[PDB]
Symmetry: C2
Subunit: 163 residues, 2 copies
């Protein structure tokens, strides 16, 4: 079969029993109580050993992923098949990449749970493949304004010169 999917491990919102299937074919069960998920799976799957849960189109359950705000990068789906990469520096966020040049984009990042992917871990059951990320000489649209790649999001207060 295929290699195992890099699973998610962190706080979950709402309790219950989560179900999913890893690309290696293994079925993984996550019992969520008080925000913590206990993993049950085959010794054959990597997620079992890491105590992680691979979120797929195969994932089932009532609980929701609740990622920590201190990620490095995230994949943000700003259209049905288009993404933008969000790089985090301290309290600020910068659009460091885009699947297409001139993609429209919101002026504020959402909560981590709204990202399709965070530091390599998928969080959504629905995720279109991600075309190559364009990180230079391209721009994104926030309303009617244009911003060169690498620009922090428009509605974010600029970092003062305190160092």
């Amino acid at each position: 079969f295929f290699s195992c999917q890099r699973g998610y491990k962190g706080v979950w919102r709402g309790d219950g029993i989560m179900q999913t299937t890893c690309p290696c074919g293994a079925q993984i069960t996550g019992h969520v109580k008080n925000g913590s998920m206990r993993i049950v799976g085959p010794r054959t799957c990597s997620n079992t050993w890491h105590g992680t849960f691979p979120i797929n189109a195969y994932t089932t359950g009532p609980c929701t992923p609740s990622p920590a705000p201190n990620y490095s990068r995230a994949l943000w789906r700003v259209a049905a098949e288009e993404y933008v990469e969000v790089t985090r520096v301290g309290d600020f966020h910068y659009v460091t990449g885009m699947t297409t040049d001139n993609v429209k984009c919101p002026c504020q990042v959402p909560a981590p749970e709204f990202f399709t992917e965070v530091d390599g871990v998928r969080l959504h059951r629905y995720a279109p493949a991600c075309k190559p990320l364009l990180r230079e000489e391209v721009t994104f649209l926030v309303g009617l304004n244009q911003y060169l790649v690498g620009s922090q999001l428009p509605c974010e207060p600029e970092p003062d010169v305190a160092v």
Copy 2:
């Protein structure tokens, strides 16, 4: 729907037609002439846009991946289902992680093609699931000698500090 696997892109040894399948379901064909690969795949698969080839148990064909030596890290299968992580610094290699404590390991690294994984890109058609990498207070073996995780391979000239 599963995420696309990160595919290999680089020199191959031996010419012929390579065939494989991405976890996303896409069939991918790689045409190799003079160690170079032309990719034929669906616009729906990430490997198609990157012009990469996902090596799996579903991989078929006469060619062998021929990775570059300037890699940073790599998974080295040193048992049926055990791994050691290799980090490279210049011309030196260090066992920077392991699947289970006290794994017997060779004294020097092989050509990159013998690594199950190189910088997150699978190279082997056969790759058991990799358990969490123990990177602290654990040791590995080389013949009859024990080494603390982090030490460079015994059969390599040990450089001076500050070098």
